[PDB]
Amino acid sequence: KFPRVKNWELGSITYDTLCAQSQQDGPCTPRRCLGSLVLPRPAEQLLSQARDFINQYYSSIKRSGSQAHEERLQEVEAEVASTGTYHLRESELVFGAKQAWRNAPRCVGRIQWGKLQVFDARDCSSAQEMFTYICNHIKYATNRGNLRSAITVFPQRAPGRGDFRIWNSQLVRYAGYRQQDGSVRGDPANVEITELCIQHGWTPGNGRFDVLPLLLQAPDEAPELFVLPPELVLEVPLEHPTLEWFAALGLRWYALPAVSNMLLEIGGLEFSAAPFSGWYMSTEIGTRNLCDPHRYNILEDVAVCMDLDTRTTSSLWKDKAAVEINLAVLHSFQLAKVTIVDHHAATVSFMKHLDNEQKARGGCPADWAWIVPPISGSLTPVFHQEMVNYILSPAFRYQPDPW
Ligand X SMILES: C[C@H](O)[C@H](O)[C@H]1CNC2=NC(N)=NC(=O)C2=N1
Q: Which residue among 109, 223, 286, 394 contacts ligand HEM (CB under 6 A)?
A: 109
Cβ of residue 151: shortest distance to ligand HEM, in angstroms?
Answer: 5
- 28 known ligand binder: yes
Cβ of residue 48: shortest distance to ligand HW1, in angstroms?
Answer: 27
**How many CA atoms within 13 Å lie on the side-chain side of 375?**
25
Based on the residue annotation, tell me whether 44 is a catalytic residue of this protein. Answer: no
Based on the residue annotation, tell me whether 135 is a catalytic residue of this protein. Answer: no
Q: String of b and e for 132-149 (b: at least 16 CB within 10 Å)?
A: ebbbebbeebbeebebeb
Q: Does 278 bind ligand HEM (CB under 6 A)?
A: yes
Q: With respect to a copy of itself, which residue has the nearer C-beta, 219 or 381?
A: 381
Q: Among residue numbers 34 through 93, which ones bind ligand HW1 (CB under 6 A)? A: 38
Q: Does 262 bind ligand HW1 (CB under 6 A)?
A: yes
Cβ of residue 189: shortest distance to ligand X, in angstroms?
Answer: 11
Instruction: Tell me whether strands 214-217 and 224-226 are parallel, antiparallel or unpaired.
Output: antiparallel
- 289 known ligand binder: yes
Instruction: Tell me whether strands 235-237 and 263-266 are parallel, antiparallel or unpaired.
Output: unpaired
* Contact present, 180 and 150 (Cβ < 8 Å): no
Residue 268's closest CA among 53, 55, 119, 69? 53
Residue 168's closest CA among 95, 281, 261, 60? 261
Q: With respect to ligand X, which residue has the nearer C-beta, 142 or 389?
A: 389
Cβ of residue 379: shortest distance to ligand HW1, in angstroms?
Answer: 16
Residue 331's closest CA among 230, 253, 233? 253
Burial of 78 (0-12, 13-18, 19+ CB in 10 A): exposed
Q: Which residue among 52, 77, 235, 284 contacts ligand HW1 (CB under 6 A)?
A: 284
Based on the residue annotation, tell me whether 279 is a catalytic residue of this protein. Answer: yes
Q: Does 192 bind ligand HW1 (CB under 6 A)?
A: no
- Distance, C-alpha 396 to centroid of its chain: 9
- By a kind-dependent CB cut-off of 5 to 8 A, residue 384 interacts, out of ligand HW1, Zn ion, ligand X, none, with ligand X
Alpha-carbon span 153 to 142, nearest angstrom? 18
- By a kind-dependent CB cut-off of 5 to 8 A, residue 396 interacts, out of ligand X, ligand HW1, ligand HEM, none, with ligand HEM
Query: Which residues sit in the known binding site for heme b?
Result: 107, 398
Residues involved in catalysis:
107, 110, 279, 284
